[PDB]
Every structure is written in structure tokens, then in C-alpha cells.
Write an enzyme that holds these catalytic residues in place. Structure first.
Site, PDB file in Angstrom:
ATOM      1  N   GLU A   1       0.743  -1.235   0.000  1.00 53.24           N
ATOM      2  CA  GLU A   1       0.000   0.000   0.000  1.00 53.24           C
ATOM      3  C   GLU A   1       0.776   1.291   0.000  1.00 53.24           C
ATOM      4  O   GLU A   1       1.140   1.805   1.070  1.00 53.24           O
ATOM      5  CB  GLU A   1      -0.934   0.037   1.198  1.00 53.24           C
ATOM      6  CG  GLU A   1      -2.315  -0.491   0.934  1.00 53.24           C
ATOM      7  CD  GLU A   1      -3.275  -0.113   2.026  1.00 53.24           C
ATOM      8  OE1 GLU A   1      -2.921   0.757   2.845  1.00 53.24           O
ATOM      9  OE2 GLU A   1      -4.385  -0.680   2.075  1.00 53.24           O
TER      10      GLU A   1
ATOM     11  N   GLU B   1      -6.682  -6.955  -0.890  1.00 57.74           N
ATOM     12  CA  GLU B   1      -7.117  -6.669   0.471  1.00 57.74           C
ATOM     13  C   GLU B   1      -8.404  -5.838   0.459  1.00 57.74           C
ATOM     14  O   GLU B   1      -8.495  -4.835  -0.260  1.00 57.74           O
ATOM     15  CB  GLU B   1      -6.020  -5.908   1.224  1.00 57.74           C
ATOM     16  CG  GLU B   1      -6.329  -5.691   2.692  1.00 57.74           C
ATOM     17  CD  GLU B   1      -5.358  -4.751   3.387  1.00 57.74           C
ATOM     18  OE1 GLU B   1      -4.130  -4.968   3.324  1.00 57.74           O
ATOM     19  OE2 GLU B   1      -5.829  -3.789   4.019  1.00 57.74           O
TER      20      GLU B   1
END
Ligand SMILES: [Ca+2]
Length: 291
Positions: A133, A220
Site C-alpha cells: 500500500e 485486500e
């Protein structure tokens, strides 16, 4: 056992048809962070048999305490342990460099993935996630050069296994990425969302990336708020699942763990499903395609 994955323009193909699979993401693998107790062959077997999960994601911590930097062999072992189990149970496995500033340790990531590429490069089950991320960082100036270097290293060893690249702002800016794709074979781009926080606006950004010819992959997603807390947003969850099913977007729910937070599938020290767990189980077992 498991059909190989290939990215053709807009979608991901399993063998020769456009497909998508649902799965689970383990919690951080860091020493002492709790999720590590789920990095076992027994757990992977439970996801295939009980959940009907087709994907298991290894979220390997990097720079935090107990992560790959502090304990390389320790963390690398939990991952290998999970991947081997996934291979044995006809499931896909994502090896994720769970970082927020991967551009800081490029040589480390290159070292790790070369080894993983040599070890698993020939099994059609393995998928590489090189940057979990990215934050408020440029795509073209920060993420792209890093990704290209890593992808270059991998491709020299493993020429065809899917590589997934994180996108700017918590992997939300998939539109920004589509405007400057990476010229390489079988690359997908990550999208992360939490039904309790993100909605139609994030869905539109995704649609724009899809229109520009880029294939996405939800490594995710949570049914709860972005901070991993709060209650399950049923409506938004359904809307997001229909979106992924429609566009054949593979996904991994975050996280099969028992930390005391809404995102966990189990209550502390138990196999008793949380509100989130019950929901995600239903989602995973009725998925249109299985590994
Ligand atoms: Ca390969």
C-alpha cells in the site's frame, strides 16, 4: 489442479476463460504480531475445506519490528510454509511485500523476490505482490520505477507469473496508474477498499482504470471501516461484491486472524466467527468460480 493466470488487456484469465476467485488474507506475519499463528498448513487446509477459499495471501511485514528486515529467515519461513500448503491444496497464493514505503528498500525486495521466483516460479499457484500500500506518493515518479526494477528481476527468472503492483493513496488511485501502465507481461494493479469507509466514488475510479485497459486485483478488502474497526456495512459490502463479480476481479478478505477488531474473522482465541467472518464466509463459499 490450478489453471495458470494470464492478463489480457482488461481481465485476468484462468487457463483460457475470464475468471475471478475469492480468498483470504492473513494478518501481518511479523514476529509477535499474532497473525503469525495462522501461517500454518493446517489453516490453509481449513480455508479450502471449510471456506472453499481459492486464495490465501501472505502479508509479510518488512520494516516494522518482527518483520523481514529484523528477521529475514524467520519471516521468509512463514511465507514458504503458507505457499507450500496452498500449492498442495489447489489454491492460488500471493506473496506480498507488505510495505508502505517499499521504494526505501529496493535491493531488499529484489533479493527476496528473486529467491521466491526461483523457488516457486514454475507452479501456476504463485502470484507476486511487490508493494502492498503506497501512500501519498507519485505513480510515475516513485511507484513505477521501483515496480519496473522488481518486475525486471522477477521476469528474468519467472517470465509469466502474475505480478500485482500497488497504486497511490492506499492503493485507491488505480485510475492514475492506468494513465501510465507498465509495459510488461502479466501485470495487474491493486485496489483496496473497506466497505465501511469507501463507496461508489472509489468504484468509479476503478471503472475508469478498467476502461483504460488495466486489470485490477483486490489483494485486500474489509467489510468494516478502513482502520479495521466499526461494524459491518452490509449494503456497501454487497454492492462491492457484485462489482467484483461483474468485472471478474479476484479478491482476498482482510484478515483471517483473531485480533480484537471488527476486521478479524474470529473472536480472540477461538474459531468462532465474528459478524465480519460470517459475512465473508458466505461470500467466499458462493463464489462463481473455485480454484
Ligand atoms: Ca512461471
Amino acid at each position: 489442479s490450478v489453471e495458470p493466470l494470464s492478463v489480457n488487456g482488461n481481465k485476468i484469465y484462468a487457463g483460457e476463460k475470464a475468471k475471478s476467485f475469492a480468498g483470504n488474507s492473513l494478518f501481518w506475519s511479523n514476529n509477535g504480531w499474532g497473525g503469525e499463528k495462522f501461517y500454518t498448513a493446517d489453516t490453509v487446509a481449513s480455508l479450502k475445506k471449510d471456506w472453499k477459499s481459492s486464495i490465501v495471501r501472505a502479508a509479510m511485514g518488512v520494516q516494522e519490528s518482527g518483520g523481514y528486515l529484523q528477521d529475514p529467515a524467520g519471516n521468509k519461513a512463514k511465507v514458504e510454509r503458507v505457499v507450500d500448503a496452498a500449492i498442495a491444496n489447489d489454491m492460488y497464493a500471493i506473496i506480498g511485500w507488505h510495505s508502505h514505503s517499499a521504494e526505501n528498500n529496493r535491493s531488499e525486495a529484489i533479493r527476496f523476490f528473486q529467491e521466491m521466483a526461483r523457488k516457486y516460479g514454475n507452479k501456476p499457484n504463485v502470484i507476486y505482490e511487490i508493494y502492498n500500500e503506497p501512500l501519498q506518493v507519485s505513480w510515475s515518479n516513485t511507484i513505477k520505477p521501483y515496480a519496473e526494477a522488481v518486475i525486471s528481476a522477477i521476469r528474468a527468472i519467472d517470465p509469466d507469473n502474475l505480478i500485482i503492483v500497488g497504486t497511490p493513496s492506499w492503493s485507491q488511485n488505480v485510475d492514475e496508474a492506468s494513465r501510465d501502465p507498465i509495459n510488461a507481461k502479466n501485470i495487474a494493479y491493486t485496489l483496496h477498499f473497506y466497505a465501511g469507509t469507501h463507496g461508489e466514488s472509489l468504484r468509479n475510479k476503478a471503472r475508469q482504470a478498467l476502461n483504460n485497459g488495466i486489470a485490477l486485483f483486490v489483494t485486500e478488502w474489509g467489510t468494516v471501516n478502513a482502520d479495521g474497526n466499526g461494524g459491518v456495512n452490509q449494503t456497501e459490502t454487497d454492492a462491492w461484491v457484485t462489482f467484483m463479480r461483474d468485472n471478474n476481479i479476484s479478491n482476498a478478505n482482510w484478515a483471517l486472524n483473531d485480533k480484537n477488531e471488527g476486521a478479524s474473522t474470529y473472536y480472540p482465541d477461538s474459531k468462532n466467527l465474528t459478524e465480519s467472518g460470517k459475512k465473508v464466509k458466505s461470500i467466499i463459499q458462493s463464489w462463481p468460480y473455485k480454484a
